[PDB]
């Protein structure tokens, strides 16, 4: 419920930054990170009673979030950081 | 003679005048030229506070010619100085006359906000960003001239905050005053609408570029800056480095270098001031360490009886001249 | 002699440790002796600074120790201020994303603000701009059950503020219709209550923080003795987007005669400014006329108007100056020839009359809101009848 809106909020800030400065290129790395989440939400909400396979894909979700942390921190360098700092802090504070 | 003129307080005045003393004018004729430059630059503020945003590209050139000039005054070149002084007098008086032909008297909005962005970035580094933000501010350029040409011997911010203060560099009072002035942006005269908006676009362009300067732990930076100034004093007073050595090795070492009465102060107000700086998480911890750091160096620079180390050089020349004179006569 | 005279007076360690102790024990009237020191320091400083005009070999490094000695005391005052944190929430509470999603965190601010609400008289009309804001956060969370408390108790306090007031009472269109505050607040108190029980909204942060920009202004100037804190690394994501919405309010592009429509007022402002320049240069070929003075002052004052101003009055002023410049251009020589200006003025008026017309065209949905403005004094009666049956 939260992250798919946080991404578009950052995207507003990223367009606003692109008006006044160089970066409009770290936006493509967010739409993929958003679209991939549906590929898990489908199965997680396809459930009616739960399954053992969801551990397998919860691991894929968790390791992917841990990966995405590194992709954000890579985009943080060479680019305005504070917009990335808050999404990072929210993901860290709700691990 | 020594029984009456002796002192007790400040003995290392000569030890600071030799290491904290910047290039200054070496001749009276250049001192007067320097004074003319300063009075001219002080009047230049009076027209800087009255032009519009499009004019802020020639003022960028004026902010550089002052550097070229105050560089040249300490070269002690006085030929082309009075020349170009007159050129800039003509330019400034031109724009002063243009100031009188303005029916829309510009009123500087967001000025306290740009000033407080400058208070965050008033560093020898990132003076290009200070230089981008001067014309919106209320900054006497004589201070900006001490950044691209570093003539400061202390943290520069101190030349700003006291006026006729220090809280906005340790709080969010700036970021609140935006929202107040952002809502009261309206209910204003249209004259102030094709000039206020251009400040806000420029303000977005500014605060993004100055963002990483904001998020630093400002209680950690002034701590570390205090250490980087305080580690140096003790190295001068006692050769070595207290990033290499322990406090008790150094306390014994003062007697090998220095008298006793001042070593008292060197441990009575100075070492414990560092002992607090090492352990400074709160801000009272900074204030205690720093107020004592202040109290110390008024007791090594300040004598009980009159004493100027510059006069020591200005006396030896006279004796050399007089013994030359007597030898010539002989 | 000046130097020792200054240190002997006001900068002895004997006097200074009084100050260090006064801050350390939280004594009284210590913050004002600080100002005496700051003023005497500026006296000494400006004296020697304008003084002697020949050396700052010693004075710069010297002032590098007294500026320090004041900076230190100011850092102490800055913590004495945190010795009085009567509220442990700063402004910009609801001006960052992460203090909203953390549902416990917003709730931990309400009980801190629970004194602010009881505080303040009736008709303060700034408190009641707050308790509206916390409701839409319930919709921002899509009906979390932890916030049933803050949802219900807030309305209880609002209804108490309203029930107290009735206890005291026992003790061109509307311009032409006369010719024959709280209602706006309570109207905002129910459409919010309605909008909770819609289907869903796909909540976005950029909408809520502008409301934060309204509330933190109120929560900063009226309330004092609050929490103080360093800046953060998310909160700027509110201010920057707020400014982006403000600056693209003057530029971007439905109602007439109370709406003000900036993009047309700016067009008026430059299309009249060119003419104001043209007449004033042409006030020097013939040194004076009263018609020219009249239209000059008209263009001046119209340009000195506000920018929330509606448009019938503006169009009135524009037609006045149009008539004045028309009668002058009639008499003036054909060398002047400001037809290019008056033509644009007339076409602007012609365009504005369509916007005057569009309001007459619909003209009902305007009326279907003034009935909708009666909702405020409906909701309290229903909550009285309904919510006070199990409570």
Short mmCIF file of C-alpha atoms in Angstrom, two decimals, chain B residues 30 38 41 70 79 86 112 118 132 169 194 208-209 248 253 266 292 295 297:
data_model
loop_
_atom_site.label_atom_id
_atom_site.label_comp_id
_atom_site.label_asym_id
_atom_site.label_seq_id
_atom_site.Cartn_x
_atom_site.Cartn_y
_atom_site.Cartn_z
CA UNK B 30 48.47 50.94 -0.19
CA UNK B 38 36.51 49.17 1.19
CA UNK B 41 32.61 48.23 -1.80
CA UNK B 70 42.46 43.14 -3.15
CA UNK B 79 49.64 52.26 -10.75
CA UNK B 86 37.69 55.09 -11.37
CA UNK B 112 16.84 36.24 5.40
CA UNK B 118 24.85 31.33 3.22
CA UNK B 132 26.20 32.41 -6.86
CA UNK B 169 22.52 26.72 11.90
CA UNK B 194 7.48 39.36 -11.71
CA UNK B 208 19.09 21.55 -4.13
CA UNK B 209 22.75 22.33 -4.78
CA UNK B 248 50.39 12.58 29.60
CA UNK B 253 56.81 17.63 27.40
CA UNK B 266 47.88 24.88 29.22
CA UNK B 292 37.11 27.32 27.95
CA UNK B 295 39.20 31.70 27.89
CA UNK B 297 43.98 31.88 24.41
#
